């Protein structure tokens, strides 16, 4: 169920500075490339060890494409200020998500090409890779414009071609890395957070990928009638952390069990205070 995606962003702030352009590439939800106009030497950069298999000519070719996207964005950004009759005084954001989904059979399943302005859906290439869906009156202008120039056939060509061809390549050089994991190291803490009541916290640390599932259960059905579960978060070193706790009557703490589900773990983890 592989996939490739390019998340591009352009933001303008008042000042003599041209808007900031950022492009992050993803292979199976894993960042592998990145370009940031705010760098001393703007060039796409390797973000996964398997990408160093690519030669200088690949990085130039991509950096040039970034260069052009940057202009396409800064230009587009200005057209939108017009469409929306907005005041040149604040800040504005233009975002794009592009890429393609593949089945494990290396077969293309779907193409993606959509844009957002100010964080709200703007215009999107439908799944038929031929027609457009425009969010508002402004988008109707872009829709008309991309229909007359036959834009879709172009992105359609990227989606069924380039996207699919290059995604096969990366998967081939990066399957080694991609399939790797880092088992979560769980444990449970005890916090006197009450009287006649206590708070148990189950922890999952240093795991990877981010996908993971934690559960509580006073032997029998599970507990969601007092379980807190923070959003998984990055450790800063490449792995992630996450926890969940539940209020328990002081003296029964040891009677609750925590189960941790991750695929780097040969089997589910069971833990008690």
């Amino acid at each position: 169920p592989h996939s490739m995606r390019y998340f591009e962003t352009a933001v303008s702030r008042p000042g003599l500075e041209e808007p900031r352009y950022i492009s992050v590439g993803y292979v199976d939800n894993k960042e592998f490339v990145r370009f940031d106009s705010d760098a001393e030497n703007p060039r796409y950069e390797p973000r996964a060890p398997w990408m160093e298999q690519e030669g200088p000519e690949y990085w130039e070719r991509e950096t040039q494409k970034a260069k052009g996207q940057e202009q396409w964005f800064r230009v587009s950004l200005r057209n939108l200020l017009g469409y929306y009759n907005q005041s040149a005084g604040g800040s504005h954001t233009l975002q794009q998500m592009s890429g393609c989904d593949l089945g494990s059979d290396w077969r293309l399943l779907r193409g993606y090409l959509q844009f957002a302005y100010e964080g709200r859906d703007y215009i999107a290439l439908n799944e038929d890779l031929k027609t457009w869906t425009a969010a508002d009156m402004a988008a109707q202008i872009t829709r008309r414009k991309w229909e007359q120039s036959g834009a879709a056939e172009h992105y359609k060509a990227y989606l069924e071609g380039e996207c699919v061809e290059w995604l096969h390549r990366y998967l081939k050089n990066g399957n080694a890395t991609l399939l790797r994991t880092d088992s979560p190291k769980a444990h449970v803490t005890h916090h006197p957070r009450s009287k006649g009541e206590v708070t148990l916290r189950c922890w999952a640390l240093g795991f990877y990928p981010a996908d993971i599932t934690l559960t509580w259960q006073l032997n029998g059905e599970e507990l969601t009638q007092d379980m807190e579960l923070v959003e998984t978060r990055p450790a800063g070193d490449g792995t992630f952390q996450k926890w969940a706790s539940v209020v328990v009557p002081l003296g029964k703490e040891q009677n609750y069990t925590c189960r941790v589900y991750h695929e780097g773990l040969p089997e589910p983890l069971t833990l008690r205070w």
Partner: peptide, 9 residues
């Protein structure tokens, strides 16, 4: 490989 946009918005 990165996409290369077509007609601006």
């Amino acid at each position: 490989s990165a996409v290369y946009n077509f007609a601006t918005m």
